[PDB]
Design a binder for these strands. Sequence first.
DNA 1: ACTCGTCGCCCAGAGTTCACCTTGGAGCCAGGGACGGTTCATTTGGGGTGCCGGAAACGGACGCGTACAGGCCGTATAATGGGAGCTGTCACGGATGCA
Length: 88
Amino acid sequence: ELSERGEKLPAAQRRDMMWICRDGDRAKNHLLEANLRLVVSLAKRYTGRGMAFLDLIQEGNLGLIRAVEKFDYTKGYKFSTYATWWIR
DNA sequence: ACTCGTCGCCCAGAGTTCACCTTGGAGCCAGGGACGGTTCATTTGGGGTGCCGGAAACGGACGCGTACAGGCCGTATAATGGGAGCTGTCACGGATGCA
């Protein structure tokens, strides 16, 4: 929003924004790497027809990325229950 | 004691060839119609036509609805590292990981 029709952000006011953005991206990556195990556990069930195990795994990672993007913690629900639908 | 089978013989004839009159014709030419292949006048019953009036089918154009086909999107107790594959060959020149 500030990029166009904003203000010239000083170093003090911009470094905080950059740091919190990087922290958020790092947290997203951490959650992805944590839930990859659920991804592979879910994807183990569709082998033997059509595609390969690695292809199924990568599709599971894509679904996990989508679920992480569309997750909502305010509902007070465990992440696996929501992510299973997207992975499937 | 004797003839009817068979021999020549003698005359009528007959149809045959020679060599004679007649007389129905083959053409042969002349002459004279009527007739039809031909030509030339009509003759107006009929073929023809161009054309748009124009009525109407018709073949397509055009604008606007409808239908499945394929595509995108989402489902909130929990669900967190995998099946498997069958391997009795022989030689061998050489790279290559560990000697």
